[PDB]
Each structure stands twice: as structure tokens, then as C-alpha cells.
Amino acid sequence: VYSYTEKKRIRKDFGKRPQVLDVPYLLSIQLDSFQKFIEQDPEGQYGLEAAFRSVFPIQSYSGNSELQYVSYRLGEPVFDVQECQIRGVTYSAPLRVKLRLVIYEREAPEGTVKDIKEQEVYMGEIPLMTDNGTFVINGTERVIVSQLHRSPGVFFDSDKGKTHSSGKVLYNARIIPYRGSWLDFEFDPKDNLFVRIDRRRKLPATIILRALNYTTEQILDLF
């Protein structure tokens, strides 16, 4: 079996190990990521849906007037890719979000609302990805390169004895979030445990424990 464009000129093939899995699509890494961002799923897992669900619902502090998000859609691009390259523009799709302003009648902790104002509103134009994993931003083709970054979680990264004489190993733990402040625990050469927040000045570790409403007796019970 030989495709027509390969039947024209077959490349003589050395190499003896049979192929079991063929080379995948080479641009999947970009296309799948942007598809997950742009496409809307009936779940908060991915993309603009995730962002809206995570932060868009808002409550008026001490006012109980709410603005909530229903759905979004991507409008048609004004220009095609080639026209954007020529004129010089971002190949983007408008973002039209459906919002509902629900007004709560005064003294209604049950949830009774006065009225709902459901309107579709424009929230910027999001650049679109061409068929080959590119973005044209100002008429020029751009590529966003995937980033390899430290994963969130807890990591224990004692130094190799490069701090103090005798090469003592000082162990430490570090909590890295996706969003928020860092929370480090470290050891000093005098064998004490110190908590540190956002890489600021050192503090004894038990302070955090006391800040979590723990007494000395139950602290020693734990440890």
C-alpha cells in the first residue's frame, strides 16, 4: 500500500526495527491547548468557562446585589487571516458574554429578588489561533512557546551543605501554589524549625501553629 504522492518516488529505507506507533501530529501541543481554552465545555474544567465560573459571579458587599454569568460565545472575526496580515491587525474573535444583574429586595436573606436584567455584553476581542498553531497579532505571525515551570505542591529541597562549615544538611519544605503566597519551613544549624512566608524574614515555625489556634500541649501532642 503506497499513497499516490509516495508512489511517485519511494525512498529506499534501511533500518530494521518495525514501526509500531507512527509519528503523531507534531503541532498537537499548541492546537489542543488553544482548543481547550476557546471551546466551551458544560463544566468549569477548562478555559473561559473556568475563568468566568471561578471569579465572574460577584456580590455587592453589604448590598446583596448580584451580577452573574450565564454563557459566552465568540463572534465571527471581522477579517480573515490574510486580510489581517495585509492591513496589520490581530486575528481575533469578539467575546460576547451573557450577564444577568439580579437585584435582591431589601431584607431578603431567603433569596427573593426584585428583578433580573439579562443582557449580552462585549468583553474585548480574543486573538484566534490559525490552523497551524500561530497567532497573527499585528499582521505578523507569532508563536507562544509552552513553558516548563515548577509544578505546584510541596517540595523538600535541603541544601547540599553549602551554607555552614562541616557541610551540615539543612532540610526545608516549600509549598508552591498556582496563585497565592509561598510557605516555607526551614532548619537552622542549631536544629530549630523556622516558618517563612513569601520569602520574608524568618520566624519560629510554632508561630504558624499558634496562628492556627493550637496550644502548646496539643502541639506537643501532635509532634
Binding site: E6, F14, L26, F34, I38, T90, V143, P204
Partner: protein, 941 residues
């Protein structure tokens, strides 16, 4: 002991202590400290371990729940402290920061979502503040939200950020290898200045996930890794690579994608392991890798095997034939270099490839691939029309596909993007077939360079260190010639003295200089211009010139008038010489179009109607006419230009760079080289048949840098061409179908048990002739990365053709006709033209523009600026006695404002003497130290 040193005694004291640590100076108070602590880690608004974060947190604490919450808890913190204590004394292992089970992959979708969420939070702040005063019927969900913050965040990410860059477009391979590029830099990663070696180093977990050699050498090495061929990404963002599952002793064909942390828990056999035609390993002891190291393991011990021997390298590294014969440094160099090859005039093919060229050519959208099978209905240089086969035809449609080929357009690097059809009229095409060849592609094969007849010998010092000697036939055939379209814009703005104009009346330029411009003042299409010619004629109003004496007099003498407009026409850069192939005019909405703008617009409108009318004729009428009115409105709507700019004219020039000494050539094995001399065809070494070699390469380059692949590539290259030569002969005399079929079939078998089978019996006589005609320039050969052609197979193929199996022939000196002693190695090597043309690198300057604050020359070749005579050059001059050289270098050639004009004048009348003077930059320094409260002065005035 921590409690002993702990100063606090109660919860409130701890809260105020951490408050003093966080916000020193601000007096701690109950409510404020409580809120600060509750907002640090336990509020969902300002703290979030993502789902991946929670999963990794629970895995590191040996919990059995893979899900959870995004904010920290008492249990989480206390368990982290407990595990830290256990590591201190018990059995605890420091986490490897460079483990690929600890480093996650962020792609465009995720980063864009993060920045969109940033915009959303900074719009919700305003939404909440506005809602602070609730209303009933005066506000709508359109006035409480402003699109500017969200748009600004998104545009800041996509346009101006470290991880979004201009797309390297001088190659299909360069594009494909840029798109799948991994970087540890950017917002949230390291910095090239202070990354540290350990993060840059290759890790045993990189195996099959991140390429070991495809990385830039320089300031950021090991920080810009590239994805391996088969690597994937988890749901959580960790790279995983495929393996074929091994039962008791059978290697099954089911593929499992293993992540880095899962890879250790099994022992994985190598791709270079044998199988006895039924899934069982031939050898009872097989080589595997369990945890970082590798060893021998019993047949009934392995859980997985490598899916292929290509899976350790990236796409670019996997295009290097005989990679296993090349030192890792030189392979790194070779991959980096072949990322920079310029598409030549005609894409040839790799005579020696690895079989990965089709994948790179097709996966990058540089060719046109059939979406549906059918019979080619109409072929043209600019389009293809396919009559889809009824099997692939949907019921409600016309079975027609129109592919519009990309003609000569400009790439990000000012190269030529152009698609040529690769099929003829009436030909059958199936889904996924290549229909047009993009830049640097040949029948769907990636074709970055040209395969050239190279000899390895010294030849008179003209290839001394890495120089290359090239024959004139190489230039004559224009096989390293490139097209270099470039834009040049003339923008007419609104100045205070008056609007700028693009008239064709230009003072101080004769009739001939304006011959290339039409009546409206813009160059014609197709006009061959030279460095200096006017492209767009522009003039800016000016007044109050303040003429000097003995110039007022001169104008009076010659009855001439000083023009009230100065010339600002767009001229061709000096040195550049091409033809004008395209002109675009952008007129502001209010301005009145000129003759050329109207003429262009009518041409675009007719083209638009022609394309739409042809589409309807080839193939619905309602959408045709509706689109014609939209397309018409878009053509004349008027352009949204920058403020003030009245009218923009872009001229596209098409240069043709042939070849010359100074241009950098390269093979695929890290063998660089600059052309030194271009030789007459009768000066080149030639063999018994009188065929000269195209290129002569120094053999002293090979041994010191262990890139032996090139030598192998040469031998096989010769062998490949040999087969073609034989076929060529059998085609010049109309021998028969049978003889060509027999020889070609014999050429595809070649001894060792290769997995490829070609049976010419199923090829119709017409198809065999097409194959032979495609093989008369040489027989393409695939040499996979670590499963290539053995040397004995190369010798056998050399024997199939009548070439010696030693790989060396006797050559004669064209200058003298005397036989070179010691037979030399000649063959065919794939040479690339790199994007380091000496046209773009030569630069000179006598005087020009000068920097603003410091009265010194400017940067390089774009501002026509000078060369930096830095501090080490000053040291070299000081070590010599060259004090006048140094003084003139740093006073009259750079900075002395009055000195340099006097030097120019003195040189003009042949008095090579200088009045050095005090450099202006020292005056700037004196005024800057004095601008602090420091009194610095020169003594003994």
C-alpha cells in the same frame, strides 16, 4: 527547642508577630492581623493550589485522595511540617527539582486563560465598586463592566510577553520546531542571568520527553529545550512518552503513555532489542533502565519497551542521518543550523534522509494536502480544483474542492513563501496527499538544501580552517539562489506646517530619476529598481529656512527659488536591487484617494468578483452575491490608520541573492563553513569521466570534531546517486520496462532484513516509468536516527552501482591535469544555505548620524552606525604604543564634536592632522556629577 525560642505564647500574639513580619511599621491590630492571616492561605480569592497542585501535594504526603480543595488547611500545614521532620531524621529523600515529574508544562491555552482571569478580576473590582450603590432601573449589565482592562490584559499577553515571539519562518522545520518549543523562562520561570547549571543539565527523566541535543548554545542553554517526537502532556501538564506493554515475554502492541514519575517503577527495555517474529526477545538478557541507571535484566522481568528508536530525539534532531556517528556537540550544532536553512530557488530533496521528511513537510501547514480523495479537475500555478470521489461526497453539496495556492509572499524573515502545484491534470489524489509544494519541500518531502558532489581534500588553502571552495557550475545552476521579498513603507502624516503629499513633483531630482514613478508618484509594478531609486515620491512642507549669506547671493545669481517643500521620498536602500512585485495603498477614511489608489482598488474589486464568479462557475448564489457586497465594502471601506498618518504606501521588493564568498553553508552534521572562493569549472578536481566536484571540503575538519556521519553521508550519498546514474542510462536508451523494473526492484531489496518491502509487480508499466523518471536524479535513501544503514549495506549499495566500495576515487587537478595521489573521498552531501548572507552583514561607515545625549555614532547597519571600539580594543591599543591611534579613535572619530568636523575638512584637503580636543561624553559626565551635589572641576584652567 523551637517553642523554647518561640517568643509567642497565644494565638493573638502569633498573629501580631506575623503581621509585624509582613507589614513592618504598621501597628498590628486584632481585626487586621486576623484578616491578613485568613487571606494568606485560607481564602479562595487569594490562594489556590490548582487541581494539579492538590494532586501533587497529596502525592507528596502519601495521601490516597487525588482531589481536594484549593486552599490550605491545618491538616495540610501540620502534615508538611511532620514530613519535613521525618525527612530530617527518618527516611526522607530530597525532591529532585529538575525531575520532569516535578516540572509541569504550560501551553498557550493555559497562559491565555490565566491572563484573561487577571483581566476579569481587575474588571470585577470596578464592577463591585459600582455596585456599592445598588439601583433598580438605571443600570444594565453593560455599563458596570469595561472591556478595556480585559482587552489590555489579553493583548499584553499575546503581543508583548517573553513567551510569545515572532515566528521563525525561514523554513518548514524552523516553524515546526518553534511551535513545539519548551522554555523555562518567562513570567513564572527562571531567568537566563541566574538560572543555575543544575536546571540547565540533562536529566535521565528527559529521556523520550525532552530532546537532549536540540537546544541553543549560548546564554540560555538547557532552558529552551524542545519536545521529543512522541512526547505528550498529561491532563495535569506533565510530559509522558509512549511504551509498548510487555507481558511475560511477549512485546504487545498496546501503547501506554508513562509519565516521568511512573517511569521509575518499571524496567523498560530498549528500542535496540530484538524479537523473534512472535513478540519474544531473542536474547535472554536485555538492556533496560529502571531508576536513572541501566543494566541487564532477564527476559521475564521487563514491563515495557521503547516504542521506537527515534523517540529520544526531537523532530529536527531526528532529521540527521547517521546521528549515532556524530558527537553530541556537533549534532546539537547541526540541528540548530538546519533550523536556519534558506529555501533555495528549487527544492531538490535529501538524497540521504532519515524518513522523517514527509512528516515534517505535511504536519507544518506549508503544503496543500487533499482534504478528500478525488481526481484532479484543474491545475494551475495559483490553484488546484479537485472533483471529489462520490464515496467521500456528502449528500447536500457539490463535490468540488478548491485549494488556493500561496504565491510569492514575505515570511517573518523576509524570505519567499510560494506554493507550486505538485500534481498534473486528471491525476487521482487520495485524502492526505500533497497537492502543492510549499517553500523548501519536494513532493511532500522536506528539502532544506541541495545535494552536492563534494570531495574531501585540501586544495590550496581555499578551504583552510572551515572555508569552502565552490565551483562555478554551482552558481550557474542557481541552486543556492534565494528570493528575499521585503516591505518598504512610505507614510505621509499631518505635520504642523502642512499635510505631507505623495505627488510626483520632487525638487532636486531629474527627469530620469522620476521615470520609474507613475503620475501619482508611486513606482510601477514590475519595475527593476536599484539601490537609491525613488519608490514613492513624497514631499514635506517647510518654511522659514533662514538662508545664509553667499547662498542668498547664489540663488539671486541663478534666478532660482528655494523650494518650500523638502524631499522625503521613499528610496531603495543602497546595495539592494530587486523588482517591484506589489504595491499597497492605505488611505485614511476622510482623505481623498489618488489615481493609483483608485486603480489598485478597481483591480482588487475585479479580482474579487472574478474569484467569486469563478467559485460559483466551478461549483449558493445567495451566499455568492452577499459575499460580493461584503467583499466590495471591505475593499473601499477606508483604513483605520494611526492618528495623524494620512496615507501609507507599502512597496514589496523581490531580491535574488545568488551566492558569493562570505555566505555561510552547512551540512546536517554541524559542519559549518563560509564560501571562500568560487572556482572555474576547469579548475575543479575531476574524475576519470571528466565530471568535476561541486564543492571541496577540508578533511582536517572531520577528525578533530567527531562528526563522522558526514563521511558516512557522503559514501551513502555517492551510492544513492550511483543508482540514479544507472537508472539514468537505462532511460537515455529506451531499454525496456522489464529491465528498469528489474534493476529498480533489485535496488530496493539490498541484503539485510529491512522492514521495508517494495514489490514492483503491482506497479503498472506507466507507474514504473514515472518512478524511474523520479529516480534518475538519484535514489532517495532513509537512514533512521539510531537504526540506520550499516556500513556493509553502504558498501553493497556502492557495489550495485559500479562505484568502488572504498568510497574513494582518483581525482585529477583541473589546473594541471595531474592525478592527485592518495585517492580522495567524493560523494554527495546535503549542503544548506544558512540565513547569514554576507549581503546582510557587510557594513561600512565614514560619518553619519550621531547619538543624542552622547555625541557618538549609533548602532549597527540599520542606523548606518559605527563599530564599537570597546574597552578591550583600547587595552590592545595601549599595549602597543599606538597613542595617536587611540587618541584619534576616542576623540575625533567618536566624540569631539568640533574635532570631527575639523578632521573631515582636513582630510578633504589632504592634511592628515587632527586637533583632538575634549570628548563630549566627558563633558556629559562632568555635568552629571555636578548635577549631584558634587563639585568636580578641571584644575589649572
Amino acid at each position: 527547642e523551637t517553642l523554647r525560642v518561640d517568643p509567642t505564647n497565644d494565638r493573638l500574639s502569633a498573629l501580631v508577630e506575623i503581621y509585624r513580619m509582613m507589614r513592618p511599621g504598621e501597628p498590628p491590630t486584632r481585626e487586621a492581623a486576623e484578616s491578613l492571616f485568613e487571606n494568606l492561605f485560607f481564602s479562595e480569592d487569594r490562594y489556590d493550589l490548582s487541581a494539579v497542585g492538590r494532586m501533587k501535594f497529596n502525592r507528596s504526603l502519601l495521601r490516597e485522595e487525588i482531589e481536594g480543595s484549593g486552599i490550605l488547611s491545618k491538616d495540610d500545614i501540620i502534615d508538611v511540617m511532620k514530613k519535613l521532620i521525618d525527612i530530617r531524621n527518618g527516611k526522607g529523600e530530597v525532591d529532585d527539582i529538575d525531575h520532569l515529574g516535578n516540572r509541569r508544562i504550560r501551553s498557550v491555552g493555559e497562559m491565555a486563560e490565566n491572563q484573561f482571569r487577571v483581566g476579569l478580576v481587575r474588571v470585577e473590582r470596578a464592577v463591585k465598586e459600582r455596585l456599592s450603590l445598588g439601583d433598580l432601573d438605571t443600570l444594565m449589565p453593560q455599563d458596570m463592566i469595561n472591556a478595556k482592562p480585559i482587552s489590555a490584559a489579553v493583548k499584553e499577553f499575546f503581543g508583548s510577553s517573553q513567551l510569545s515571539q515572532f515566528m521563525d519562518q525561514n523554513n518548514p522545520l524552523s516553524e515546526i520546531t518553534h511551535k513545539r518549543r519548551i522554555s523555562a523562562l518567562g513570567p513564572g520561570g527562571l531567568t537566563r542571568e541566574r538560572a543555575g547549571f543544575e536546571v540547565r543539565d540533562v536529566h535521565p527523566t528527559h529521556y523520550g520527553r525532552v530532546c537532549p541535543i536540540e537546544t541553543p548554545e549560548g546564554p540560555n542553554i538547557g532552558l529552551i529545550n524542545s519536545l521529543s517526537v512522541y512526547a505528550q502532556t498529561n491532563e495535569y501538564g506533565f510530559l509522558e512518552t509512549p511504551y509498548r506493554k510487555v507481558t511475560d515475554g511477549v512485546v504487545t502492541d498496546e501503547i501506554h503513555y508513562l509519565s516521568a514519575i511512573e517511569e521509575g517503577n518499571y524496567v523498560i527495555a530498549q528500542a535496540n532489542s530484538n524479537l523473534d517474529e512472535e513478540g519474544h526477545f531473542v536474547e535472554d538478557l536485555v538492556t533496560c533502565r529502571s531508576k536513572g541507571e541501566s543494566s541487564l535484566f532477564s527476559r521475564d522481568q521487563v514491563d515495557y519497551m521503547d516504542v521506537s528508536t527515534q523517540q529520544v530525539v526531537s523532530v529536527g534532531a531526528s532529521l540527521i542521518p547517521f546521528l549515532e556517528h556524530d558527537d553530541a556537540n556537533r549534532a546539537l550544532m547541526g540541528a540548530n543550523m538546519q533550523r536556519q536553512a534558506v529555501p533555495t530557488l528549487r527544492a531538490d530533496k535529501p538524497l540521504v534522509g532519515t524518513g522523517m521528511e514527509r512528516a515534517v513537510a505535511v504536519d507544518s501547514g506549508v503544503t496543500a494536502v487533499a482534504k478528500r480523495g478525488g481526481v484532479v479537475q484543474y491545475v494551475d500555478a495559483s490553484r488546484i480544483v479537485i472533483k471529489v470521489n462520490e464515496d467521500e461526497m456528502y449528500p447536500g453539496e457539490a463535490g468540488i474542492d478548491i485549494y488556493n495556492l500561496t504565491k510569492y509572499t514575505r515570511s517573518n524573515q523576509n524570505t519567499c513563501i510560494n506554493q507550486m502545484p505538485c500534481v498534473s491534470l486528471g491525476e487521482p489524489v487520495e485524502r492526505g496527499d500533497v497537492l502543492a509544494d510549499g517553500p523548501s519541500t519536494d513532493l511532500g518531502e522536506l528539502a532544506l538544501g541541495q545535494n552536492m558532489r563534494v570531495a574531501f581534500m585540501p586544495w590550496n588553502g581555499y578551504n583552510f580552517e572551515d572555508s569552502i571552495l565552490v565551483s562555478e557550475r554551482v552558481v550557474q545552476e542557481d541552486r543556492f539562489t534565494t528570493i528575499h521579498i521585503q516591505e518598504l513603507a512610505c507614510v505621509s502624516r499631518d505635520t504642523k506646517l502642512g499635510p505631507e503629499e505623495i505627488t510626483a513633483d520632487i525638487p532636486n531630482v531629474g527627469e530620469a530619476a522620476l521615470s520609474k514613478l507613475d503620475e501619482s508618484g508611486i513606482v510601477y509594478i514590475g519595475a527593476e529598481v536599484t539601490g537609491g531609486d525613488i519608490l514613492v515620491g513624497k514631499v514635506t512642507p517647510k518654511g522659514e529656512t533662514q538662508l545664509t549669506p553667499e547662498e542668498k547671493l547664489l540663488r539671486a545669481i541663478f534666478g532660482e527659488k528655494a523650494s518650500d517643500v523638502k524631499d522625503s521620498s521613499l528610496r531603495v536602500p543602497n546595495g539592494v536591487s530587486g523588482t517591484v512585485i506589489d504595491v499597497q495603498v492605505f488611505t485614511r477614511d476622510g482623505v481623498e484617494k489618488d489615481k493609483r489608489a483608485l486603480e489598485i482598488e478597481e483591480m482588487q474589486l475585479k479580482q474579487a468578483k472574478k474569484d467569486l464568479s469563478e467559485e460559483l462557475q466551478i461549483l449558493l448564489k445567495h451566499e455568492f452575491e452577499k459575499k460580493l457586497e461584503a467583499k466590495r465594502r471591505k475593499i473601499t471601506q477606508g483604513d483605520d490608520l494611526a492618528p495623524g498618518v494620512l496615507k501609507i504606501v507599502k512597496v514589496y521588493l523581490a531580491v535574488k541573492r545568488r551566492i558569493q564568498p562570505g555566505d555561510k553553508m552547512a551540512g546536517r552534521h554541524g559542519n559549518k563553513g563560509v564560501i571562500s572562493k568560487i572556482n572555474p569549472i576547469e579548475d575543479m578536481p575531476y574524475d576519470e569521466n571528466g565530471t568535476p566536484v561541486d564543492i571541496v571540503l577540508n578533511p582536517l575538519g572531520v577528525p578533530s570534531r567527531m562528526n563522522i556521519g558526514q563521511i558516512l553521508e557522503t559514501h551513502l550519498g555517492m551510492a544513492a546517486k550511483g543508482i540514479g546514474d544507472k537508472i539514468n542510462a537505462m532511460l537515455k536508451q529506451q531499454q525496456e520496462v522489464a529491465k528498469l523494473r528489474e534493476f529498480i526492484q533489485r535496488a530496493y531489496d539490498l541484503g539485510a532484513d529491512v522492514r521495508q518491502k517494495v514489490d514492483l509487480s503491482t506497479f503498472s508499466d506507466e507507474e514504473v516509468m514515472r518512478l524511474a523518471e523520479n529516480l534518475r536524479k538519484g535514489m532517495p535513501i532513509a537512514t533512521p536516527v539510531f537504526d540506520g544503514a550499516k556500513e556493509a549495506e553502504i558498501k553493497e549499495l556502492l557495489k550495485l552501482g559500479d562505484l568502488p566500495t572504498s568510497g574513494q576515487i582518483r581525482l585529477y587537478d583541473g589546473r594541471t591535469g595531474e592525478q592527485f595521489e592518495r585517492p580522495v573521498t567524493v560523494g554527495y552531501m546535503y549542503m544548506l544555505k544558512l540565513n547569514h548572507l554576507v549581503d546582510d552583514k557587510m557594513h561600512a561607515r565614514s560619518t553619519g548620524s550621531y547619538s543624542l545625549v552622547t555625541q557618538q555614532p549609533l548602532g549597527g547597519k540599520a542606523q548606518f552606525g559605527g563599530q564599537r571600539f570597546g574597552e578591550m580594543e583600547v587595552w590592545a591599543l595601549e599595549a602597543y604604543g599606538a597613542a595617536y591611534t587611540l587618541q584619534e579613535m576616542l576623540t575625533v572619530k567618536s566624540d569631539d564634536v568640533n574635532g570631527r568636523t575639523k578632521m573631515y575638512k582636513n582630510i578633504v584637503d589632504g592634511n592628515h592632522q587632527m586637533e583632538p580636543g575634549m570628548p563630549e561624553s566627558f563633558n556629559v559626565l562632568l555635568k552629571e556629577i555636578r548635577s549631584l551635589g558634587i563639585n568636580i572641576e578641571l584644575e589649572d584652567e
